[PDB]
Amino acid sequence: APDCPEVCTCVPGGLASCSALSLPAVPPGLSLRLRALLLDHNRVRALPPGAFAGAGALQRLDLRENGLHSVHVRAFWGLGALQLLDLSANQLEALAPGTFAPLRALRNLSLAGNRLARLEPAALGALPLLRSLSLQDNELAALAPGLLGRLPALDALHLRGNPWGCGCALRPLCAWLRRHPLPASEAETVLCVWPGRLTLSPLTAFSDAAFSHCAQPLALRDLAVVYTL
Amino acid sequence: APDCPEVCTCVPGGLASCSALSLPAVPPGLSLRLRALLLDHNRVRALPPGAFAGAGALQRLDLRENGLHSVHVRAFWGLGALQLLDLSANQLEAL
Amino acid sequence: PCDSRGQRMWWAFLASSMVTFFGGLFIILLWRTLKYLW
Amino acid sequence: GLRFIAANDKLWFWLEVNSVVDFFTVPPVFVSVYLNRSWLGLRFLRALRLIQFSEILQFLNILKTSNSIKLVNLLSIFIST
């Protein structure tokens, strides 16, 4: 069938699997008849722009254990209907802003086991329909404020195995955790890293009193006092 | 059993073996019921701080042939009872 | 605790110093002009 | 305040280097004490206060001869800048 890649295996219903093929690049001949694509355990180190062009009706895309290190801003071309992304177990150190912008129907985004030192609010983009995230096994030192402000439907998150520096930089991070009770199994595996004075301290146990000295938002009384002092 | 990792194999007595699994990181869900842990022949290059948190009663820890290159100061958190460490056959250049 | 700096509010000190200096200059100039204009 | 009381011309005293460093040094420390937050901003201007040393020595009558006055002036200006 023309809608199936020659080297891959396809089944009725638009499910295509290309695993265990040692593909050096993305297979060509994408079709709108395929709904799910599997590409794990390959060697597609570089993703060309518009690699997934043609399969606009695809719903699930997997790229786990593929050694990804750089993704173009327009690589996710023709994927407005894509819902599942698995970029975990890769070597992604940086993400260009606007890469995930067209993914309006994204529901699960995997970034585990990656070397992403910093994740920026503009990197994720507008993700209203997103329900869960996975940022474990990364080098995320701290989450910049405003990253979670564009995820109204975010209800699940994984942060185990990260170099969380417990300071005022993660006050918005704790704000999400307080109103989203993490399971005790996952909570016990989330701890501070630096400074050493706060080692072995779970992030959910830090309350407002513990960080009352953090930078409060500018008020109107202190605004006049600083001018008039 | 909840005290055993899903991808690893455990036997009665708190002995858990995770060898020959190609684990990219330390398995989660550590428990105090496990006394010995095996993690050799994996690809856990980086050890996050407090990775072994929870298994304070562990006695034997193995990390041979795992390509370790840097260990955090607080990584082996909650291991006052740990007795055996095998960091050999790795790429540790500084401690 | 530590790491008490999430953002920067450097403008407060600079605004205070600048408003002090410029208010002094403006009040002195206003006094001079009022004396000039009796 | 004592200098301002004794100042002859107020406008030209407002533009002196010592006055400027006082204006940009004291209120920021007051605000830092008020807000319990210290910022290392224009605090380096205190070295400009090092300039007013030859006048200090001449007021105390320690520094009289012309050569030593000029040497102290040059050294203070150089180090302060």
**DSSP-based three-state secondary structure for C26:** helix
The residue of chain A with its CA nearest to that of B29 is A185
| Residue A17: other Cβ atoms inside 10 A | 17
Q: How was this structure determined?
A: cryo-EM
For residues A135 and A183, give the distance between their C-alpha atoms in angstroms, rounded to a whole number: 16
Residue A44 in tokens: 């597609």
CB-based contact D37 A222, cutoff 8 Å: no
Residue showing tokens 């992030």: A203
Give the distance from CA A168 to its chain's centroid: 22
* Contact (CB, 8 A) for A37 and A61: yes
**Distance between CA B80 and CA B49 in Å, rounded?**
15
Q: Considering only CA atoms, which of A38, A48, A95, A41 is closest in space to residue A76?
A: A48
Residue in A closest to B52 by C-alpha? A189
Cα–Cα distances in angstroms (integers) from residue A54 to residues A8, A29, A30, A59, A207, in the given order: 17, 8, 5, 13, 49
Nearest CA among B11, B37, B3 for reference residue B23: B37
Q: To which residue do tokens 């010995």 refer?
A: B36
Q: Which SS3 state, helix, strand or coil, does residue A100 take?
A: coil
Query: What single letter denotes the amino acid at residue A139?
Result: E
Among B88, A80, D54, A13, CA closest to A1: A13
Task: Please name the residues in contact with D21: beta carbons below 8 A apart, sequence gap of 6 or more.
Answer: D45, D46, D48, D49
**C-alpha–C-alpha distance, residues B88 and A47, integer Å:** 37
- H helical segments located in chain D: 2-6, 10-14, 17-35, 54-59, 66-80
Q: Do A229 and D27 touch (CB under 8 A)?
A: yes
Q: Which residues lie below 8 Å from residue A196, measured CB to CB, with a gap of 6+? A: B73, B74
Q: What is the 3-class SS of chain B, one letter each residue?
A: CCCCCCCCEEECCCEEECCCCCCCCCCCCCCCCCCEEECCCCCCCEECCCCCCCCCCCCEEECCCCCCCEECCCCCCCCCCCCEEECCCCCCCCC
Nearby residues of C2 by Cβ (< 8 Å), 6 or more positions away? A167, A195, A197, A198
Contact A36, A60 (CB under 8 A): yes
C-beta separation of B39 from B63 below 8 A: yes
| d(C-alpha A12, C-alpha A4), whole Å | 10
Q: Name the residue with tokens 């959910």.
A: A204
**Token pair for A199:** 């080692």
Contacts of C7 in chain A (CB under 8 A): 145, 215
Q: Write the residue in D11, D23, D39 that is nearest to C20 by C-beta.
A: D23
Beta carbons of B48 and A196 less than 8 Å apart: no
Nearest CA-CA partner of A193 in A170, A209, A214: A170
Judge contact between A154 and A131, C-beta under 8 A. Answer: yes
Rounded Cα–Cα distance for residues A59 and A81 (Å): 6
Q: Which helix (H) or strand (E) holds A156?
A: strand A156-158
Asked if D35 has any chain A CB less than 8 Å from its own CB, the reply is: yes
Tokens encoding B54: 């929870």
The number of helix segments (H) and strand segments (E) in chain A equals 4, 10
**Distance (Å, rounded) from C-alpha A144 to C-alpha A138?**
15
Residue with tokens 């989450």: A143
Whether the bond between B5 and the residue before it is cis, its omega within 30 degrees of 0, is no
Could you tell me if A48 and A29 are in contact, meaning their C-beta atoms sit under 8 angstroms apart? no
Tokens of A180: 């989203």
Angle B28-B30-B31 from CA coordinates, rounded to 5°: 155
Cα–Cα distance measured from residue A199 to residue B75, given in angstroms and rounded to the nearest whole number = 10
Which residues in chain B touch residue A113, judged by CB atoms under 8 angstroms apart? 24-25
Element (H, E) at A16: strand A15-17
Cα–Cα distances (Å) from A153 to A88, A90, A108, A130, in that order, read 22, 26, 12, 6
Sign of CA dihedral A58, A64, A67, A73: positive
Count interface pairs A-D at CB distance under 8 A: 11
β-sheet bridge partners, residue A37 = A16, A61
The total of other beta-carbon atoms located within 10 Å of residue B54's CB is: 20
B9-11 and B15-17 strand pairing: antiparallel
Say if CB A202 and CB A190 are below 8 A apart.
yes
B28 contacts on A by Cβ (under 8 Å): 160-161, 185-186, 189
Q: Give the residue carrying structure tokens 């007013």.
A: D52
Q: A120 exposed, middle or buried (CB, 10 Å; 0-12, 13-18, 19+)?
A: middle
How far apart are alpha carbons D27 and D24 in whole angstroms? Answer: 7
Q: Does C3 touch chain A (CB under 8 A)?
A: yes
Measured CA to CA, the distance from residue B61 to residue B79 in angstroms comes to: 10
User: Contact, A121 vs A147, CB < 8 A?
Assistant: yes
Give this entry's resolution in angstroms.
3.6
How far is CA D35 from its chain centroid? 26
Q: Quick check: A100 and A122 in contact, CB under 8 A?
A: no
| Neighboring chain A residues of D30 at a CB cutoff of 8 Å | 229
Task: Indicate yes or no: CB of C17 within 8 angstroms of CB of D10.
Answer: no
Amino acid making up residue A172: P
For residues A14 and B48, what is the distance between their CA atoms, to the nearest angstrom?
40
Chains in touch with C (≥3 Cβ pairs < 8 A)? A, D
Backbone angles phi, psi at A66, to 5 degrees: -115, 0
Residues of C in contact with D35 (CB under 8 A): 12
